[PDB]
């Protein structure tokens, strides 16, 4: 089906399992794929017929910059469940949350993270 | 099956919900996947046995740079419908229309956009 | 299941529908996913149990740099058929052939190309 | 299913069939996708309800930087096996191992490598 | 002489002549070079003997994201003058302020910007 | 002293020595450094006391996408002369014109081009 | 001016004033330019007529990954004085030490750092 | 003043002190800035009034892929020395020769190399 895409959202947060990460913070990367039929809106050109990717972006921002949690799993789940709950027309959502800079990892990487898929339950 | 790929097409355009957006304009990124059996052409080396990506390119350009619409959905929808309409050989099209620079977003992102798939009817 | 991956191969060739493209040539981008079981080789660690990706690399290179063809479809199709023919161990080949610099396109793009999948 | 992602891990190693490769060594790139349910940890926010991607990273680092083998196939296989062996919770694992720099090739490429998918079979 | 470096600072502001630019806003790219002797701080390992690049960062962030101006020149001028006014130890400052996304330009570019060098004249 | 910077300008043109290049064309990359005092404008905030970078952009754009020339030297010369001729306050101009995709070159490169400095 | 060039050296270390930085560590970027006449070596092809850039790299690596300091100024100063002290043929050194990931900065940057130049004596 | 620029040239060569480096080889990155007045050619649009950067590219390629040298300094010295000797119009040459992949270094860098300037 059709989908709204929010790619490479960069936000500063305070999530982490190491106590120090929760008071120092770091950058996070977020990809969000929201499944929704966009044909009605594509034929009417009326924003009310779709869901604004700005409201989905805003929701993601509030969560990532929110209260510090220990795991990316928790934050991604929050983003996913929050998105489905706030926007009833969304059928499913895929959230990829990552840390491009992992503390104590000495060598070079792109990022380490989680990748979850959630359908309307 | 097989597919013609048009990746990272950048076009300046005036689409947007905000009034000033339709005035100033901005850059839009387009990804197009045209589903069509390419075996015939690959075994004949005759351009007439396939769809020229140049023609798909120009059709997409004309749209994106055209009369301003409010939503990316409407623009991607036109590209899909018009592509299927003009090239009967194509069986289905996937269109990804995104804005690398979303007005008012103060944080870094790659892009925000829509992603639709349309089979021939 | 398993596969050998050749990503981002760059070769200068002379393919194209416009006559001048064929005499001037240009750069082409090649991606190849060769479907072949790799567990055997993964456990013996001997070369006889797999195919050299360097052999797959050379075959594509020779084709892309070979005789000029009008379409990318023809080149990709050649790579696919040639690969399956050259290595019986291969079960399927996915070939992506693109042009990062398309003549007469006056605006920025990643590339325009083809993407075929051919099973034995 | 949910999965843990380790993308673009860069490690120096000495694998290869050519003796000069085992002497000189080179950089290897690896992507790992660990299939594992993250719902429980997503609800508890307790690191114990999941598998630390740091642990997977360090197991992978140890393998690639370890005893030199002839083929990528073999190293990718060790990574998959040891991962499954060390982390019961993980249902499957996809490992992509590649060489950005293939010796003797005069032209530019991104990388040549392997892509395997493994689960605990009989 | 020595210098603190602030490279590729990205900020969202509303500078510009065009009316639509003032309301919509856009991203701005900023490089800052601050000429200042670092030998002392490099020997005492004391943050107070040098100028914290965070303070220089904050000053610039406040300018660029602050009150709207028609020209990058004006903004660049303000950053330079304010930096020199705030930290008497800096002897000179070079500011490079650019717009990576210039409205109404149909083709691609890296950016269009200004590059000024200002030395303490007071 | 101060200068207006136009970095990484991409324009499609038909310059070149090879007859095929003239027919097909290709992308060209342009960097322009214009030395001119920005203090006055920096204090007045009036676009009138400076040079619009869009004016420089347009001049170079009309040149590169224009009539085909043989050399990058010629095109770059046109840009520099035209810029100085149009804005006397410009003390000097530096023009970097390059070709990222050079015909017949098989290996990878960033680009080949010219880099001139012109004053009055 | 003839010189040896070490560009973009990435090393993990623990420098910084914040306690969390000292604990967690982070990536550091170093560029080193070593001015020395290379004409003799360029004509003799004798390593002895030049300075091995591997020894200068190795020296820098030990410093950045070594004993933690509060300031980048200090680390850079150490690399400079040590390089000049150990390799007498070096006429002057330029050290650019930077932090690509500055803690508690919510916006994007390339990096913040120091750039120092030190001549023999 | 003016100069011809050859940026980011990637050539495969076999230079190095370690024996294995000479048998295996590696990629080398070369930047070349050749100083030469381009004013005449810029006004005449005649290739003969300038030096073709394709020839400069060719020379450099020949040297980097030729007989192995122990040091980068030696290769860059030849590149400069040979360019000045083959093209009398060049007044000076700056050669940057680097190794993006240094054997046994496992920390990630951009490159290690040399940077020399040779005047007529
Ligand atoms: N899986 C997982 N592992 C971690 N190791 C350290 N932090 C995390 C996290 O958030 N998720
Ligand atoms: N989904 C969607 N959301 C928007 N929000 C603002 N503009 C758009 C648009 O074009 N599509
Ligand atoms: N599909 C396709 N279209 C082209 N248009 C010009 N050349 C080609 C080609 O090789 N394939
Ligand atoms: N498949 C495969 N082919 C190679 N050719 C050279 N080395 C290798 C390797 O490790 N795996
Ligand atoms: N030089 C300069 N030119 C412009 N043209 C439009 N806006 C500007 C600006 O801020 N500075
Ligand atoms: N110097 C120079 N050499 C070329 N060789 C082919 N075209 C050109 C050009 O425009 N300038
Ligand atoms: N100049 C400078 N400023 C800092 N601010 C916080 N840490 C540092 C440092 O190491 N150097
Ligand atoms: N300066 C320099 N140092 C090296 N160390 C190892 N090889 C080289 C070389 O070619 N030049």
Coordinates of C-alpha atoms in Angstrom, one line a residue, chain E residues 1-11 29 31 33 37-47 50-51 53-54 57 61 65, chain G residues 17 21-22 68-75 77-78 94 96 98-99 102 105-118:
Chain E
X1 CA 48.7 32.3 15.0
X2 CA 46.5 29.7 16.6
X3 CA 42.7 29.6 16.2
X4 CA 39.5 27.9 17.4
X5 CA 37.5 26.3 14.6
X6 CA 33.8 26.1 14.2
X7 CA 33.0 24.2 10.9
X8 CA 29.7 23.7 9.1
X9 CA 27.4 25.1 11.9
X10 CA 23.9 24.6 10.6
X11 CA 21.1 26.9 11.9
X29 CA 25.7 27.3 7.0
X31 CA 32.1 28.5 9.4
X33 CA 37.7 31.0 12.6
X37 CA 46.7 32.3 21.2
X38 CA 46.2 28.8 22.5
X39 CA 49.7 28.1 23.9
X40 CA 48.8 29.0 27.4
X41 CA 45.6 26.9 27.7
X42 CA 47.6 24.2 26.0
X43 CA 50.1 24.2 28.9
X44 CA 47.7 24.7 31.9
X45 CA 45.0 22.4 30.6
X46 CA 42.6 24.9 32.1
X47 CA 39.3 25.8 30.3
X50 CA 41.1 29.7 26.5
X51 CA 37.8 30.6 25.0
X53 CA 34.1 27.1 21.5
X54 CA 30.7 26.4 23.0
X57 CA 28.9 28.5 19.1
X61 CA 23.4 30.3 17.1
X65 CA 18.4 32.1 14.7
Chain G
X17 CA 35.8 18.9 30.9
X21 CA 32.8 12.9 28.5
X22 CA 35.7 11.7 30.7
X68 CA 43.1 12.1 29.2
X69 CA 43.3 15.9 29.2
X70 CA 40.6 18.6 29.7
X71 CA 41.3 20.6 26.5
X72 CA 41.9 19.9 22.8
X73 CA 44.4 22.7 23.1
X74 CA 46.5 20.5 25.4
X75 CA 46.3 17.3 23.3
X77 CA 50.0 20.9 21.9
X78 CA 51.3 17.5 23.0
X94 CA 50.4 22.1 12.0
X96 CA 44.1 20.4 13.8
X98 CA 38.6 18.5 16.6
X99 CA 35.5 16.9 18.2
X102 CA 30.1 17.9 20.7
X105 CA 24.8 20.8 21.1
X106 CA 21.4 20.0 19.7
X107 CA 22.0 21.3 16.2
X108 CA 24.2 19.8 13.4
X109 CA 27.8 20.8 12.8
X110 CA 30.8 19.3 11.1
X111 CA 33.0 19.8 14.2
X112 CA 34.5 22.3 16.6
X113 CA 38.3 22.2 17.2
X114 CA 41.7 23.8 17.4
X115 CA 44.2 24.6 14.8
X116 CA 47.8 25.2 16.0
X117 CA 51.1 25.8 14.2
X118 CA 54.5 25.1 15.8

